[PDB]
Design a protein around this ligand. Structure first.
Ligand SMILES: CCCCCCCCCCCCCCCCCC(=O)OC[C@H](COP(=O)([O-])OCC(O)COP(=O)([O-])OC[C@@H](COC(=O)CCCCCCCCCCCCCCCCC)OC(=O)CCCCCCCCCCCCCCCCC)OC(=O)CCCCCCCCCCCCCCCCC
Ligand SMILES: CCCCCCCCCCCCCCCCCC(=O)OC[C@H](COP(=O)([O-])OCC[N+](C)(C)C)OC(=O)CCCCCCCCCCCCCCCCC
Ligand SMILES: CCCCCCCCCCCCCCCCCC(=O)OC[C@H](COP(=O)(O)OCCN)OC(=O)CCCCCCCCCCCCCCCCC
Ligand SMILES: CCCCCCCCCCCCCCCCCC(=O)OC[C@H](COP(=O)(O)OCCN)OC(=O)CCCCCCCCCCCCCCCCC
Ligand SMILES: CCCCCCCCCCCCCCCCCC(=O)OC[C@H](COP(=O)(O)O)OC(=O)CCCCCCCCCCCCCCCCC
Ligand SMILES: CCCCCCCCCCCCCCCCCC(=O)OC[C@H](COP(=O)(O)O)OC(=O)CCCCCCCCCCCCCCCCC
Ligand SMILES: CCCCCCCCCCCCCCCCCC(=O)OC[C@H](COP(=O)(O)O)OC(=O)CCCCCCCCCCCCCCCCC
Ligand SMILES: CCCCCCCCCCCCCCCCCC(=O)OC[C@H](COP(=O)(O)O)OC(=O)CCCCCCCCCCCCCCCCC
Ligand SMILES: CCCCCCCCCCCCCCCCCC(=O)OC[C@H](COP(=O)(O)O)OC(=O)CCCCCCCCCCCCCCCCC
Ligand SMILES: CCCCCCCCCCCCCCCCCC(=O)OC[C@H](COP(=O)(O)O)OC(=O)CCCCCCCCCCCCCCCCC
Ligand code: SF4
Ligand SMILES: [Ca+2]
Lengths: 101, 273, 121, 195, 342, 148, 216
């Protein structure tokens, strides 16, 4: 029998996977952008799961706005990555390192 | 005249553009390529599909014609001319005959002169039908070649009825033309001429004012008078730029003086003109 | 839920069926046709001459900016589908709120167009 | 069965998500990512949130394709041969375990039912239900979302826009205005006459 | 048999039989679509087209299909082998899969879902991945160039595709495909169909459909004269057959959508003839005939010029139409000519 | 019987769907093109052009094969999946023709690829080529198997 | 003269299209000035697609021949290479940018001395020019990972192929009348096994002819 806990567990796994992708990636900033999308997908699973099991539409409304910000974030994330690639010639995570101390 | 290092309107210089270009996008365009005419190996350097360098490799159809000609008599060499610009073979035969006739100081009969003009203009239509309608096929129009090559088929039959060959006539000879035309052939050429403008209208209706056709040709390949003189341009390559140069008028040969025709010229010197 | 069973289970069933049909068609030649590979046959095609390189090099995408704007415009249109479905029940605020939303969209679109962002780099 | 449908989508999403972040091939990551979004859409349908299930696929099919464009635009020069992973896996496992313990005892507040702003109606289809609240009760958020999207439009253009000034360009409307009657004309060239 | 058809098994067999009916119709029509496509070009081209393989060439597609089944599969040495075989599979599978929600008559639909329009959009757009992944996975330059053009094509026709049909949803009040057809029922035959109140969007949808199907004037991912065969250059035998099958199935889906959204689906153009699946099929094949005629008469755009059409022509026009239709529907101008909802 | 009638079906499908690579070298290609034009309409036999060798069953060597071109012709032939058939069209491809004694010409395309049919002429007429293609179909019917 | 443009054009049109894919070779040929390694009288024709004559019977090989010759040797960063008949040292300079070190053997004291001067003037330091007979090689610094012979041969003497490491590669242009075949050899179990690589022509090196006497 599938209850709320089943969906929350899936959400937690995707969320930790997406967080994990950010702080283990070294070679590509686009894959970090993919991990951020995994992290936000996990959030929507929570909101949809809570919404349907409570019988409330707010969580589904919240999901639509999370998608809006996810789209805006991807657009800006790719734009910032474009200007970095032009200035550095690479998009490796290990190359975003000039400033330190 | 070198765009390999990209130049941007904001003056930006990318880090990679600074490095020396060792790993470029080079592609073999031909020989086995529908737009390459079978024997063109053009090496293209592309930058986001912008052509930055084009390096035609030719000779894939070099057959040593000029060497082979040195061990043959003048008559034995006449068929070699057919096979150079083989879309319109008798037009190429004409230069060989004219050169021999000039050196030998020979005058060809009047009827042979008229026949040479007749079949030279058949060749011009044979070529322009091929050029225009396969050019349309190069920009994606499937139908124009089918209509045009039906008219070519009829003209190739006029070739065969004059000499017995549809393409490589070997019909113009030093001293005139090999054989006289049957009277019924002249009737059929006249009948074909009455229909032909209708096909030209149909091709014009399909293509000339089509917006897609215009967007594929207008302002493409612009040639100025100065460009024409850089590269030895002749024919439509100069007339499209507005230079009313045509050897049939500027340096008349055969009996073209007594014919009535006009020279079309373009104003913009692009693919559309 | 009945709606799930009556309407969505057939989608899942047909997804498997269409997949089986496509897979069987690939396996038909894999099992019947003669296989005779050799180094020249399996080399990359570049019109009769060897390729200069493979297709794993950087390539400038001159429509990159339009593709970023494609992502944004995708979300804008998404907000219209629930509005269009609910059109009969919309209140005055719900109706004119969308008009304001679409007006803000058009200001962004007019900014892109005037800037030149719709012309390829 | 619902149990089979859940685990098909649940295992597909979780496995796909893992493959996105640990795989070495960025194009393979792109294809794993779209599988994760499709699997999550399957879960959304099972719960009766069909509109956001379908909206999610529509949005991320296009968005993931754009990601593929940037992967090949900025493809690394070492594709053929493309850390503290042990410690990282330990912190990830610890975080996942903590979340699992918190979800073991999950129970909503006893007031949660009475506080619902948009209670779901069995007789109303999901898309109609969302449309009844999205544009009236949440109208302020709806308008702010439009500005969030506008900021992305301005930012992307501000940050990146540039045009090559060394390539040949055509104005399409000027191409379509070219009059054949004006651009070509016949000339009466007399014999012997050059330019 | 009553004791049977009510069980899980009789329920399971019913779905499988319904699924075979869709595959039979779509694949059976594929025999005559490829034939009919070629016959139409030939007729416009003063020639016959296939006329020897079977009577009047009617068995030509069987010969073509069989030829590929006994043709060798060549796998490029440098290709990404899993993605190489996934690309043709997705191309054919997803195009066929979209037909699960297509209704052909009253109650003749495998899945009657509330979001049928969005599901169509989801499945058709995911089908493009077959072209993008097929070109890239081959690992050769011509398929690689076509792969980028395919991504460009998606960005060109999808930005306004949703807006083009939003008007029909406003008038109907539903995304259910059957509901859209019922909204076009009335006492004036074809004058109740949506082609009339949404005449501009019929043109915009048809053109967008051509681009979505990689059909001329938007056959840019193959583009023989520029790219040899585009994304299919390195594909042979049945994997290549699947790409062609998917191209025609996707075309057939657009013919269904054109007829459902704008020409009343299975409704009769005249009151005195009955409604039924025959009207749906007649309209589908008229629109296929339009697909074939266009291929015979138009040249090819540059793919940057296709993007101009989508963003600077279709996007402003479709957006303007949605606003106009909303005002006309909101105020019931012309007595609800644009407001068909109850 | 089963196997002979199976081969007959295979030979029927292969003859009725004989796709040829878009490959023309010289003035034999002009007549090859006329064979596909309305007067003859080669495609009405199911014999349609294909731009890519991966989708081609038939190569028509239509024109002179030079030494510089010979490796390119061999390569695209090697990239045809099997079965693959070759028609030699015209004197140059058949034996070198008018350029037989040249320093830069292959004296017959059968020095590079195996040939199934030779079509004589310089050029063969569009009808002569159509006859040659139908002789290839007779050859396949006579000797065709699953291998070729 | 803008020799840089001529050098780039030579690589683009004479090396890249001739199945030379090794980017180390393309990088090296884009950087080593060919005109600095030809006699002064040949400086303006340094980038022509033909063999340059250095001395009677000796040439600087055509760019296509050298590009393909180096591309198939497949030189590694840790390789020690024997370049037989280095002439003025152009080939040694190109290989020096890829291999660890090069031993360049030249037989004409005039060219050997010029090779040292020109190699130094280009700041090439992993190339040693050793003066002596070409057919002998340089057995003092053997074994070598790769051997490049820069002129046509009829036979490669055993003494020369013994200086090749097991698993080493030797590339030589063989002459059979008017026909020239570049072959690539691999040392296996002590025997060098030769295979066809491509067709190219050059004059015969002195000392590599075959024994040809009376035949009835
Ligand atoms: C709510 C309604 C929203 C609908 C409209 C969306 C907003 C678009 C406005 C942005 C246009 C803009 O920036 O250009 C202004 C244009 C000047 O643009 P520009 O930057 O100088 O460059 C000219 C274009 O590049 C030159 O054009 P081009 O070469 O890119 O080709 C596109 C061609 C194609 O034109 C079109 O197809 C656009 C037609 C507009 C449709 C919008 C109304 C539809 C009404 C519904 C009716 C149903 C359909 C039947 O359009 C034009 O010629 C541009 C005219 C400007 C469009 C004004 C609307 O003129 C103005 O200055 C007017 C500003 C107001
Ligand atoms: C609407 C609904 C539509 C449904 C769509 C169904 C899609 C097809 C089924 C999903 C795939 C199931 C699992 C695939 C496992 C394949 C495998 O072993 O992967 C190795 C292959 C590659 O194997 P490889 O040996 O080339 O490389 C392995 C090493 N790496 C990955 C690091 C390079 O990778 C993939 O399959 C990546 C993509 C998988 C997901 C594809 C589905 C995308 C849908 C569009
Ligand atoms: C012309 C051929 C006929 C045209 C119509 C094609 C329709 C095929 C799709 C069938 C759709 C379907 O799912 O049918 C279900 C329907 C009733 O099913 P029920 O279980 O009551 O309701 C489902 C609840 N969601 O079932 C029915 O009422 C019966 C469905 C019709 C079955 C007959 C069609 C079989 C396929 C014919 C293949 C040959 C046609 C192709 C030839 C070329 C055409 C140009
Ligand atoms: C609608 C559905 C169509 C289904 C697909 C149809 C195509 C499949 C059948 C292939 C066509 C028949 C065929 O292959 O013909 C071969 C044979 C010809 O016989 P004949 O010409 O006398 O022998 C020549 C020997 N070299 O054939 C005959 O003589 C005909 C004998 C009947 C064969 C039927 C297939 C079993
Ligand atoms: C897109 C997502 C698809 C989701 C489909 C899930 C439907 C399950 C709904 C449910 O609980 O009812 C199932 C339902 C049981 O519902 P219950 O009454 O809650 O147990 O099971 C069935 O009736 C299914 C029996 C037919 C099985 C079809 C087999 C197909 C292969 C042949
Ligand atoms: C262990 C330390 C002391 C704490 C003692 C409590 C033990 C629970 C520790 C939880 C940590 C383990 C992670 C799993 C969480 C279990 C949640 C639970 O038991 O909830 C009750 C709950 C019972 O269901 P209910 O009766 O409907 O609430 O457990 C379940 O059955 C939840 C099923 C989870 C589904 C997993 C899906 C996997 C997807 C594929 C991933 C790859
Ligand atoms: C050619 C493919 C034929 C596809 C099956 C035709 C029946 C369509 C499906 C349908 O009506 O639902 C099954 C539907 C379920 O039972 P019903 O509720 O009694 O109609 O019909 C049947 O029982 C199947 C009768 C047709 C058998 C033809 C199989 C060959
Ligand atoms: C063409 C088939 C049309 C059949 C029809 O009108 O539906 C009858 C009937 C539906 O009932 P109706 O609504 O009275 O037409 O279809 C079936 O139940 C099965 C039809 C036969 C399936 C095998 C066809 C093989 C071809
Ligand atoms: C849902 C997913 C459904 C399947 C999607 C297609 C992707 C999976 C297939 C990848 C196969 C990779 C095999 C590569 C290889 O070297 O084997 C060639 C393999 C070996 O040759 P064979 O021994 O003649 O099969 O050739 C094939 O015919 C592979 C056909 C793949 C069948 C599945 C599609
Ligand atoms: C964009 C193009 C707009 C074209 C303008 C068409 C004006 C139609 C006005 C219908 C007025 C009316 O009674 O609406 C309620 C009326 C309700 O009719 P019912 O659905 O049968 O009750 O609207 C409809 O849904 C059907 C109207 C059909 C009459 C169209 C007449 C057009 C003739 C010219 C065709 C060319
Ligand atoms: S055989 Fe004759 S017609 Fe054919 S290519 Fe050779 S010269 Fe031209
Ligand atoms: Ca550049």
């Amino acid at each position: 029998m599938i209850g709320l806990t089943h969906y929350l567990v899936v959400g937690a796994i995707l969320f930790v996977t997406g967080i994990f992708g950010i702080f283990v990636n070294r070679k590509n900033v686009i894959v970090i952008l993919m991990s951020i999308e995994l992290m936000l997908l996990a959030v929507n699973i929570n909101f949809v799961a809570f919404s349907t099991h409570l019988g409330d539409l707010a969580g589904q409304v919240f999901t639509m706005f999370v998608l809006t910000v996810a789209a805006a974030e991807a657009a800006i994330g790719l734009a910032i990555l474009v200007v970095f690639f032009r200035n550095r010639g690479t998009i490796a995570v290990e190359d975003v390192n000039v400033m330190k101390g | 005249g070198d765009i390999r290092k990209n130049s941007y309107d904001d003056g930006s210089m990318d880090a990679l553009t600074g490095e020396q270009s060792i790993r470029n996008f080079n592609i073999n365009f031909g020989p086995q390529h529908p737009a390459a005419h079978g024997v063109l190996r053009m090496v293209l350097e592309l930058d986001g599909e912008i052509v930055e360098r084009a390096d035609p490799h030719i000779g894939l159809l070099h057959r040593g014609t000029e060497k082979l000609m040195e061990s043959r008599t003048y008559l034995q060499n006449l068929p070699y001319l057919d096979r150079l610009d083989y879309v319109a073979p008798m037009n190429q035969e004409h230069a060989w005959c004219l050169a021999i006739e000039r050196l030998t100081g020979t005058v060809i009969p009047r009827r042979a002169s008229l026949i040479r003009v007749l079949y030279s203009e058949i060749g011009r239509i044979l070529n322009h039908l091929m050029g225009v309608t396969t050019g349309a096929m190069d920009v994606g129009a499937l139908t124009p070649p089918l209509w045009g090559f039906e008219a070519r088929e009829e003209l190739m039959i006029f070739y065969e009825r004059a000499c017995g060959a549809r393409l490589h006539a070997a019909y113009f000879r030093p001293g005139g033309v090999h054989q006289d035309l049957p009277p019924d052939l002249l009737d059929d050429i006249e009948e074909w001429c009455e229909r032909f403008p209708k096909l030209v209208d149909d091709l014009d209706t399909l293509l000339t004012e089509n917006r897609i056709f215009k967007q594929r040709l207008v302002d493409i390949g612009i040639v100025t008078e100065a460009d024409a003189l850089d590269w030895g341009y002749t024919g439509v390559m100069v007339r499209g730029s507005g230079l009313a140069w045509d050897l049939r008028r500027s340096q008349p040969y055969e009996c073209y003086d007594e014919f009535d025709f006009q020279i079309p010229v373009g104003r913009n010197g692009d693919c559309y003109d | 839920m009945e709606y799930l069973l009556q309407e969505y289970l057939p989608i899942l069933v047909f997804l498997g069926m269409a997949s089986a049909l496509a897979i069987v068609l690939i396996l038909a030649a894999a099992v019947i046709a003669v296989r005779n590979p050799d180094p020249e046959k399996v080399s990359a095609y570049e019109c009769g001459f060897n390729a200069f390189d493979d297709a794993r090099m950087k390539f400038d995408v001159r429509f990159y900016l339009v593709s970023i704007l494609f992502i944004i415009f995708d979300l804008e249109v998404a907000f219209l589908f629930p509005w269009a479905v609910s059109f009969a029940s919309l209140s005055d605020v719900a109706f004119w709120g969308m008009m304001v939303f679409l007006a803000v969209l058009t200001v962004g679109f007019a900014y892109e167009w005037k800037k030149g962002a719709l012309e390829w780099a | 069965m619902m149990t089979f449908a859940f685990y098909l989508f649940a295992i597909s999403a979780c496995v796909a998500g893992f493959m996105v972040v640990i795989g070495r091939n960025p194009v393979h990551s792109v294809l794993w990512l779209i599988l994760a979004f499709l699997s999550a859409a399957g879960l959304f349908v099972l719960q009766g949130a069909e509109f956001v299930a379908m909206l999610l696929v529509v949005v991320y099919v296009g968005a993931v394709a754009v990601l593929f464009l940037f992967v090949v635009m900025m493809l690394d020069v070492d594709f053929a041969e493309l850390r503290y992973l042990p410690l990282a896996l330990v912190i990830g496992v610890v975080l996942l375990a903590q979340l699992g313990i918190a979800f073991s005892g999950w129970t909503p507040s006893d007031q949660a039912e009475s506080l619902r702003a948009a209670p779901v109606d069995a007789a109303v289809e999901n898309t109609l239900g969302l449309g009844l609240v999205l544009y009236d009760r949440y109208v302020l958020m709806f308008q702010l979302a439009g500005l969030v999207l506008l900021v992305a439009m301005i930012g992307a253009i501000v940050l990146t826009m540039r045009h090559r000034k060394d390539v040949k360009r055509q104005n399409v409307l000027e191409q379509m205005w070219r009059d054949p009657a004006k651009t070509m004309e016949l000339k009466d060239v007399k014999p012997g006459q050059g330019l | 048999m009553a004791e049977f058809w009510a069980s899980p098994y009789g329920f399971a067999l019913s779905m499988l039989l319904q699924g075979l009916a869709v595959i039979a119709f779509v694949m059976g029509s594929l025999i005559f679509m490829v034939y009919g496509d070629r016959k139409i070009w030939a007729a416009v081209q003063m020639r016959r087209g296939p006329n020897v393989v079977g009577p009047w060439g009617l068995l030509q597609t069987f010969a073509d299909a069989l030829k590929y089944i006994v043709k060798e599969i060549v796998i490029p040495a440098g290709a990404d082998k899993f993605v190489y075989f996934l690309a043709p599979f997705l191309s054919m599978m997803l195009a066929l899969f979209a037909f699960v929600v297509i209704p052909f008559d009253e109650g003749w639909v495998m899945a009657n879902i509330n979001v049928g329009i969005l599901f169509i959009f989801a499945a058709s757009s995911l089908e493009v991945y077959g072209v993008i992944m097929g070109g890239w996975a081959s690992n050769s330059k011509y398929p690689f160039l076509a792969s980028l053009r395919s991504a460009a094509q998606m960005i060109s026709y999808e930005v306004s595709l949703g807006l083009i049909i939003i008007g029909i949803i406003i008038s109907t009040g539903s995304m259910n495909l059957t509901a859209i057809v019922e909204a076009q029922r009335g006492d004036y035959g074809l004058l109740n169909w949506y082609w009339l109140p949404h005449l501009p969007m019929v043109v915009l949808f048809f053109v967008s459909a051509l681009a979505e199907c990689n059909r001329p004037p938007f056959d840019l991912v193959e583009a023989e004269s520029e790219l040899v065969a585009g994304f299919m250059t390195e594909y042979s035998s049945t994997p290549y057959l699947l790409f062609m099958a998917g191209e025609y199935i996707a075309m057939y889906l657009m013919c269904a959508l054109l007829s459902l959204l704008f020409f009343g689906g299975w409704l009769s153009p005249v009151p005195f003839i009955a409604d039924g699946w025959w009207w749906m099929v007649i309209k589908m094949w008229f629109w296929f005939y339009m697909f074939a005629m266009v291929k015979a008469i138009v040249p090819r755009y540059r793919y940057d010029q296709l993007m101009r059409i989508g963003w600077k022509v279709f996007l402003p026009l479709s957006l303007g139409w949605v606003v106009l239709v909303a005002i006309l529907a909101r105020y019931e101008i012309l007595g609800g000519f644009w407001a068909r909802f109850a | 019987f089963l196997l002979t009638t199976t081969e007959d079906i295979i030979n029927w499908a292969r003859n009725g769907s004989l796709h040829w690579m878009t490959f023309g070298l010289a003035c034999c290609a002009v007549e090859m093109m006329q064979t596909s034009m309305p007067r003859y309409d080669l495609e009405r036999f199911g014999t349609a052009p294909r731009a890519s060798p991966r989708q081609s069953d038939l190569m028509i060597v239509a024109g002179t094969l030079t030494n510089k071109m010979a490796p390119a012709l061999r390569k695209v032939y090697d990239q045809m999946p099997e079965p693959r058939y070759v028609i030699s069209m015209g004197s140059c491809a058949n034996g070198g023709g008018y350029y037989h004694y040249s320093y830069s010409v292959v004296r017959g395309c059968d020095r590079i690829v195996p040939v199934d049919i030779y079509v004589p002429g310089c050029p063969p007429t569009a009808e002569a080529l159509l006859y040659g293609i139908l002789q290839l179909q007779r050859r396949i019917r006579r000797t065709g198997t699953l291998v070729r | 003269t803008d020799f840089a443009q001529r050098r780039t054009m030579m690589v683009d049109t004479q090396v890249r299209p001739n199945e030379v894919t090794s980017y180390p070779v393309i990088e090296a040929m884009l950087n080593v000035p060919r005109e600095q390694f030809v006699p002064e009288s040949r400086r303006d024709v340094a980038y022509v697609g033909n063999n340059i004559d250095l001395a009677p019977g000796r040439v600087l090989l055509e760019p296509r021949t050298l590009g393909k010759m180096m591309d198939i040797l497949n030189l590694q960063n840790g390789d020690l290479v024997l370049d037989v008949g280095c002439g003025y040292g152009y080939s040694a300079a190109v290989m020096a940018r890829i291999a660890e070190a090069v031993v360049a053997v030249e037989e004409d004291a005039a060219m050997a001395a010029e090779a040292e001067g020109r190699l130094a003037a280009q700041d090439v330091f992993n190339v040693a020019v050793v003066q002596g007979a070409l057919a002998e090689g340089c057995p003092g610094q053997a074994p070598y990972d790769a051997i490049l012979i820069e002129g046509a041969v009829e036979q490669v003497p055993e003494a020369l192929t013994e200086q090749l490491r097991e698993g080493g590669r030797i590339v030589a242009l063989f002459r059979e009348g008017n026909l020239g075949i570049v072959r690539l050899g691999h040392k296996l179990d002590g025997r060098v096994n030769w295979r066809f690589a491509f067709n190219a022509v050059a004059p015969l090196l002195p000392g590599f002819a075959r024994p040809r006497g009376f035949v009835l």
